Amino acid sequence: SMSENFERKGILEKPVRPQSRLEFSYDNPLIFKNLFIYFKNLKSKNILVRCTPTEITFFSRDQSQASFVIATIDGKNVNHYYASDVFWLGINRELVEKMFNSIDRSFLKITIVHRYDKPETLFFIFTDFDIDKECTYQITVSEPELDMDLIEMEKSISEERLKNYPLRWEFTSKQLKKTFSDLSNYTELVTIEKLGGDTPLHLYFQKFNSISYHEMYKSSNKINLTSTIPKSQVFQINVKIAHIKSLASAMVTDKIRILCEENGNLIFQSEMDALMLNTITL
Amino acid sequence: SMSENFERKGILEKPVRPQSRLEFSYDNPLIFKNLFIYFKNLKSKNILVRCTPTEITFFSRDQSQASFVIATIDGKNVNHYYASDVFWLGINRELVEKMFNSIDRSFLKITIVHRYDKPETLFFIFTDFDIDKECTYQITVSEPELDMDLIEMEKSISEERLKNYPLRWEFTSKQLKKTFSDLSNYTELVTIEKLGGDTPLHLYFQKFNSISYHEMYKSSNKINLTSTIPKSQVFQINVKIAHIKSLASAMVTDKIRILCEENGNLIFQSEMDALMLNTITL
Amino acid sequence: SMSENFERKGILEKPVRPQSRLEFSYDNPLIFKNLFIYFKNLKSKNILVRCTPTEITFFSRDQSQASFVIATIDGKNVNHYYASDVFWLGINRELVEKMFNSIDRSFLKITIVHRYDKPETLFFIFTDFDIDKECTYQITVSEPELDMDLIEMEKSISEERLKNYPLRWEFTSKQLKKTFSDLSNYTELVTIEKLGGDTPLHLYFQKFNSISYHEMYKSSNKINLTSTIPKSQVFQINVKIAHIKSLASAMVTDKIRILCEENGNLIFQSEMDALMLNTITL
C-alpha cells in the first residue's frame, strides 16, 4: 500500500458481503488482546457475545462469581460496523486464548465476521500490511448460556445509578496496578475509608505485631476524587484484592474510574477509544 | 586503544603463532551465540567441525533426527583466518553451551585457535577492549564421530540442486518466528499450499468443530516468492512445526530463504555476514 | 507542587516531631531496594540496625556465615537526619522484603521514623509526588541480637587496616556481575593470581579433560589495580563464587573496590551517594 491509511466509517447501512450477519473492522486490535488477558486473569470459562445494529458487547463472570464484566465496543467509534439484528453467541475463552495473545504490533487491523451460511462459526482476521499477510481464524461458537442476571447487571451500570455512588476517583492503570500489587504482597483484603468533607482517601490494612500499611491520598483533586458522604460521616468498606489485581494487571486502558458504595460493591470504568469496559464486583 | 578499529584481512598465507593449525578471529561474536542457541533448541549432542584452508564448517543433526544443519563461516569474510590443511574436530554441545551463551556486547572479538602442540584442545578467546580483558576457554575436543551422511547433505545444498525446488520465498527472522510460534499454539503440523500461477501462498491447519487457521500471503512480491509450479497444478505438503520454531526462535539471521519440494523436504538458508547457515529437514 | 525540588539539609539539631528518636529522609530510595535485594540474595535472616546522631548502619551476616555486610548511610549526605542518641534495632528481613521491593521510580522520597512512643515500631514512608500519595509502613522491630563480632568487623574495615591489603582493583557492577556469573556456569571456586610487578591479574579454574577458563586483565590501569606484592612473589588465593555473585547481581552501586589478602579474605567496598557498603568475606 503506502509505505516508508484507514478511515473510520462507523455503522454501515449494509454489509459488503451479502451473507454477513455481522461485519466488524477496527484499527486497534490490541484492545482485544488486553480484553482477553483480563478474561484470562479472571479465569472466565465462557464469553457471552451480544451483537446489535449499534454495538457488540462481551459479557463474562469471574470463576469465583464475585465479578461481572461488561465490555462494549461502539459501532460508531469503529472503522467498519454492520449487524443485521440482535443475536447472541457463546465463545469458549480457552479456545481463543492464544489467538488473542498472538495479536502484536505487526497487525494493524482486526476483522470479525459472522455469516448466516456458517451459523456456528466466528471469523477473526488479522492483517499484516507490511507483507499483505492475512491471518484468518475460524472459531466454533455455541448458542450462548443465556444468563438471566445479565439484565440486572446492565441495569446496574446505568447513569441513573452510578451518580448515587458516594465515593469515586480515578487511577491510571499503572497506579491501580501499583496499589493492588503492593497490597497483594501482604493481604487479601483492604479497607477503604473516607471521612465526609475534604479529608484524604485512606487505604489500609492492619496486622498486629508484624506489619500495618496505610496508603493516603492527600490531594483529592489529583486523583479526581469526589465525595457525596455527609460531612463528618465515615465511609468504610472492605474489598478483595484478587479480582482488582486481575483488572489492573491486564492494563486494559489508561484511566480507570473507581466507584464505591457503602455495602462494599465496587464498579470499575475503564474507557479507551471504542471500548467501554465495566467491572461490577458484588 | 582508541576510545570515546579492526580490519578484515581474510585468509592468510601464514599463521601468527607457528604451532597454530588453525587461527580464526572475527569481530561479530554474537554470530556464534545465536548459532549455538540454535544447536541447543535442536538438542544437538555433538557438533562436528571441519576446518579447511578456506573456511570452517559446523555440522549437526537435531535430536529428533529429522533436521541436519550445515553452518559455514567463510575465511575471506573474516578478520583473520589461517588453516594448515583439512582436519576435523568433535565438540560436545553441552560442554560449550554456557560459554557461547556468555557472549555479549562487551566482547568485540572472538578468536579460535587449534595447535599441534595440544591436539585435543580448542581455544576460544573473547576480548573486552574497554578494560583489555581476555577471556580464554580451553575446550577438550574429540576426533569426530565421522558421519557418512555428511557427504550426501553437503551435495543436497549445491545450487544446481536447489534451483529446482519449485516453491521458494523469504521471511525476516521475526516473521518466521511469528508464523511458527502462532501455529505451535494450536498444531504440530501445517499444510503449505500453492496453486500454479500468481495465486497466494497458503498456510493452514483444520481442526473440526474447534478452530481452523489460515495464513495467506496476498502479494508474492513482498515475500520474494517465486513459483516453478505448472499452471493449475497444486503444490501441497505438510511440515513439522517444532524444528522450524527452533531455527526461527534462535534468530540467527535477518532474512531466511525457505525452499520446498513436493515430497515435503524443506531447506532454510539464513545468510548473515560471514556465516551461511543451511538447514535441511528431511 | 511544581510539575511539568528537595534540598539536602544533612544533620539537624533537633527533630520536626517532638517524640521522634530518629528522623530520616532521602531522595534516592532505590538505594534501599538494592541494599535489601543484596540481603535477600545472601538469605539474611535478621538485619541489625544501629542509629547514632551521625549515621545509620545496617549489619548482616549471610546464611552460610562466610560474609558480613556493613551498610552505613551518612546523615550529612542525606536530605534530613536526626537521631537523639545511640540505639539499636532488629529487623526480620522476610517481613520487609516485599516492602523494599515495592520501591520504584514513582517514589521520590523515603522517610524512616522511630518514636519513643511506639518503641517496637519502625515507620517507612514512601511519597509519590505526582498524586501526593503517602505510603506508610508500620514495621514491628525487635531489640537486636547482641552480636559480639560486630566490634571486630567494623574494626577490620578501618583505613589503617585496609591499606595493607596487597592486591586491590575496581570493577563496575556490570563487570563484577559478568565475571562471576560466567564463572558460576562452570565452577564454585576461582583462583586469583598476581605476580609481583606489572604483570596481569589472573582469574582462572582448571578442570581436566573438559574445560579450563582463564580471564586476564592486561592493563592494570584500566581496572585501577595496584599491587604491593614484592617483585617476583606470587599472590594466589581461592575464593567462593556464590556470595560474590549475590553482591554483583544486587547491582547496589556502580563501582566496587575489591581488596584481597594472602589468606583468602576479600573485602568489597561499593560506595554510592549516601551509602557506603562494605562486604567482609572471611
Numbering used by the authors:
A (entry chain B), B (entry chain C), C (entry chain A): 0 to 3, 20 to 297
Excerpt from the paper describing this PDB structure:
AsfvPCNA is a hypothetic sliding clamp family protein; it is coded by the E301R gene that is highly conserved in ASFV strains. The crystal structures were determined at atomic resolution and confirmed that AsfvPCNA can assemble into a homotrimeric ring-shaped structure. Different from homologous protein structures, AsfvPCNA has a very unique amino acid sequence and conformation at the IDCL, J-loop, and P-loop regions, which are involved in partner recognition by PCNAs. Although the detailed molecular basis remains to be investigated, AsfvPCNA has a high dsDNA-binding affinity and can enhance the catalytic activity of the AsfvLIG protein, which plays critical roles in both DNA replication and DNA repair pathways of ASFV.
